[PDB]
C-alpha cells in the first residue's frame, strides 16, 4: 500500500526538452505503454468496434485497420483466426486521435 | 513485426451494450493499462514534472503527490529512494483528469 519509491533511476540529458534523448534513455522501459487491451464487439473490413478496460467502446476504421488487413479480409488461410466478436486485440490512439489495431512488442 | 492476429477469443455477453458484463469478461486482462512509465525531469515537494513514453510532458501537483510525499521532501536521509531528476515513476490520470504518482501491482 505504502509508496516504496521509484523502481529505477535514468541519467538525464542537460536539455529537458530534447525528446529524442529522453526517449533514448527510456528505450528499455514502458514499451507496452499506451497499447491497450480491447475486446471486439463487431468487425467488418471497414470498421471494428471494440470495448476497452476504461469502459469506452471505440471504432477503428481507415488507417487504423491497415496493419490488421489480413485478419479482416476473409482470407481462407486465416479462417477463424480472423478478427470477430470476442477477439482480444490491442489498440493504440494515434496523435491525430484515431485508434489503431496494433500488437504487444 | 507483421501483424499476428488476435491473441485469444473470449465469450461475450448476449447484451453487447452491458458495460458491466463486458468489464467482467476482461477482469484478468489489461489491469494496469491505465498506469504509465514516466521519467522525472524536475521534483520539489509541490510539483513533479515528468516525461511519458508518448513524448508528452506531464505535471503532478497537490493530491497527485500525496501517496509519494515522503519521498519528495528535502531530506537527504530518505536515501537512494528519494524522487529526484531521472527517477522512473509510474503515473495514472484520475477520473477528474489529474495525474497522480502510483505504483504497479
Mind explaining what this structure looks like?
The structure is a homodimer of 105-residue chains. Chain A is mainly beta. Chain A has a domain at 33-105: Nucleic acid-binding proteins (OB fold (Dihydrolipoamide Acetyltransferase, E2P), Beta Barrel). Helices cover 7% and strands 29% of the residues of chain A. Chain A has one helix and six strands; from the N terminus they run E-H-E-E-E-E-E. Chain A has one helix at residues 19-25; strands at 8-9, 36-43, 48-52, 57-60, 87-93, 99-102. Chain A starts with 7 loop residues before the first strand and ends with a strand. The relative contact order of chain A is 0.20. At the A-B interface, strand 1, helix 1, strand 2 and strand 5 of A face strand 1, helix 1, strand 2 and strand 5 of B. Strand 1 of chain A pairs antiparallel with strand 5 of chain B. Chains A, B: It is found in: Cell inner membrane.
Amino acid at each position: 500500500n505504502a509508496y516504496r519509491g521509484p523502481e529505477a533511476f535514468l541519467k538525464l540529458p542537460k536539455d529537458l526538452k530534447d525528446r529524442e534523448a529522453l526517449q533514448d534513455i527510456m528505450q528499455d522501459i514502458g514499451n507496452s505503454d499506451d497499447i491497450l487491451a480491447a475486446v471486439v464487439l463487431s468487425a467488418t473490413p471497414g470498421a471494428v468496434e471494440a470495448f476497452r478496460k476504461n469502459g469506452e467502446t471505440i471504432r477503428i476504421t481507415g488507417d487504423g485497420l491497415k496493419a490488421a488487413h489480413r485478419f479482416l479480409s476473409n482470407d481462407p488461410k486465416i479462417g477463424e483466426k480472423r478478427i470477430r466478436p470476442g477477439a482480444l486485440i490491442r489498440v493504440k490512439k494515434t496523435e491525430k486521435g484515431s485508434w489503431q489495431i496494433v500488437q504487444l512488442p
